Design a protein around this ligand. Structure first.
Ligand SMILES: Nc1ncnc2c1ncn2[C@@H]1O[C@H](COP(=O)(O)OP(=O)(O)O)[C@@H](O)[C@H]1O
Ligand SMILES: [Mg+2]
Lengths: 371, 55, 66, 55
């Protein structure tokens, strides 16, 4: 039979059968209970709208993501999300399909063990396998080397790989991602008068960020230009009218990636953690990693980031090496495409964690040889 | 619109590939010519050593 | 590896562009001219309705004026 | 329209420029490589005649 390539993610759940080009169903991972009282009788009001249904009734819900930073903080809601994904968005019972979840690097063990225990006890799948979210993004590019920066919505991690041999001592995981950029944008919009507070209006700020923000090639020059002319002010229409005008908030929101001091984080930007991740590698594979830098994940879709990052790394790196940044147009679904490719391989067909193996060793089987 | 963006992306992929190939070929030319000129210098020094041996 | 990039890239590099051009051409042809012609037709019908309304209003005002 | 034409023409020009530059570089690379081969072949015989002279 065919395998189910699910990809929990944090912000958008992407799923679909193995062997295709794009995920079959992509929908936000939010579960929102209603918060008001409700007076109409017999309206058929449910107790929790999940997935894309709660992005249409979000006016009277309190949306809450079940995955904070890669890790899962609310297991009941995550179980609800998985149940919805299997039964309503794909309509395939899990009793007859292997599953291939994905997990960020350096995550707590208990999260992974609970994930496999749920998949084997509640949904009762035949066999499931957990894979690191960066190796798949490297599969999708058709490479076999390269250092991949997978800046998702929950957590940004940077896994270097050479000739198929991952370097476990050079993984640099940073917890700045799309959600923190949304919060920072929502916080700097208040400088013009627009106040978004409700958890429903966070979605509106996210839409503003997606449609308007861009990464500046040079930050100081843009700050000077936006403060003199008015060629940058782009307007946007809220879900009820009252258009708003975003000035130099456009390139200040995604600039947080390269200067995490804006949101008070100490660490260095995504332009310098990649160079540090390279320098921890051996001295003989640094040229190949320099030449095959891969971008993935949703948050790396800002217009103009593949040039800013290249300029920064070229500034840091030695002058002789060639710096090349691979930015495929299908960046958002790169991890899932790689997952489909991996699940479609014949050599991989014996790596699944078969159910009888789980019955013999318990949930701690995932840390064992079947990784 | 829709198809126009994809066509632009194709025109940009061609741009990147052609530019990268041009740069790589230029680096190859630089390396090869440096090799040749160093070999020529070695040949010259051998001629001079032969001259000293002849003396 | 790196040999399926051709068979997954070069395909859509031309087929997708040509198919989207075909879709745009057929959609424009189906949509724009038919919409403008239909709007002109509805405008003519609207003018005829306006004439009928004027005639009826005037005759009723003529009779009822007492 | 206007923007599509100019952008497309400029990008095609960029591709053509990179391609021709790469071809020129590769031609010079091949010529330099062959000349280097000639230098090697002559240098070996120069060494042989030097060795005979020294003997
Ligand atoms: N076109 C876009 N431009 C800018 N940011 C985007 C765009 N699309 C998605 N994002 C950001 O990326 C996030 C989605 O990232 P995603 O790759 O789905 O995360 P995950 O790894 O959990 O799947 C969204 O929250 C949004 O903030
Ligand atoms: Mg991801």
């Amino acid at each position: 039979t065919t395998a189910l390539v699910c990809d929990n993610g944090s912000g958008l759940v992407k799923a679909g059968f193995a062997g295709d080009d794009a995920p079959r169903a992509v929908f936000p991972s939010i579960v929102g209970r209603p918060r008001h009282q409700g007076v109409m009788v017999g309206m058929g009001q449910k107790d929790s709208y999940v997935g894309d249904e709660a992005q249409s009734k979000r006016g009277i819900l309190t949306l809450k993501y079940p995955i904070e930073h890669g890790i899962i903080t609310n297991w009941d809601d995550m179980e609800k999300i998985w149940h919805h994904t299997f039964y309503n968005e794909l309509r395939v019972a899990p009793e007859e399909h292997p599953t291939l979840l994905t997990e960020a690097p350096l995550n707590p063990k208990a999260n992974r063990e609970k994930m496999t225990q749920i998949m084997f006890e509640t949904f009762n799948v035949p066999a499931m396998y957990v894979a690191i979210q960066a190796v798949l993004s490297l599969y999708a590019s058709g490479r076999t080397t390269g250092i991949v920066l997978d800046s998702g919505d929950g957590v940004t991690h940077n896994v270097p790989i050479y000739e198929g041999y991952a370097l476990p001592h050079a993984i640099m995981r940073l917890d700045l991602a799309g959600r923190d950029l949304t919060d920072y944008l929502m916080k700097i919009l208040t400088e013009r008068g627009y106040s978004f507070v409700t958890t429903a209006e966070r979605e509106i700020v996210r839409d503003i960020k997606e449609k308007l923000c861009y990464v500046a090639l040079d930050f100081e020059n843009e700050m000077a230009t936006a403060a003199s002319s008015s060629s940058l002010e782009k307007s946007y229409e809220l879900p009820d009218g009252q258009v708003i005008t975003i000035g130099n908030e456009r390139f200040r929101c995604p600039e947080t990636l390269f200067q995490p001091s804006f949101i008070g984080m100490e660490s260095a930007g995504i332009h310098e953690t990649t160079y540090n991740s390279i320098m921890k590698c051996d001295i003989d594979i640094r040229k190949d990693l320099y030449a095959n830098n891969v971008l993935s994940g949703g948050t790396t879709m800002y217009p103009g980031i593949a040039d800013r990052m290249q300029k920064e790394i070229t500034a840091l790196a030695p002058s002789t090496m060639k710096i090349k940044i691979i930015a495929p147009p299908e960046r958002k679904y790169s991890v899932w495409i790689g997952g489909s490719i991996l699940a479609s391989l014949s050599t991989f067909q014996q790596m699944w964690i078969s159910k009888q193996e789980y019955d013999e060793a318990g949930p701690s089987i995932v840390h064992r040889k079947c990784f | 619109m829709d198809a126009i963006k994809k066509k632009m992306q194709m025109l940009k992929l061609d741009k990147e590939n052609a530019l990268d190939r041009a740069e790589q070929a230029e680096a190859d030319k630089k390396a090869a010519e440096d090799r040749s000129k160093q070999l020529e210098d070695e040949l010259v020094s051998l001629q001079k050593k032969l001259k000293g041996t002849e003396d | 590896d790196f040999d399926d990039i051709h068979r997954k890239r070069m395909e859509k590099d031309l087929n997708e562009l040509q198919a989207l051009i075909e879709a745009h051409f057929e959609n424009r042809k189906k949509e724009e001219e038919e919409l403008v012609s239909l709007k002109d037709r509805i405008e003519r019908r609207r003018a005829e309705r306006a004439e009928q309304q004027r005639i009826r209003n005037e005759r009723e005002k003529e009779r009822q004026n007492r």
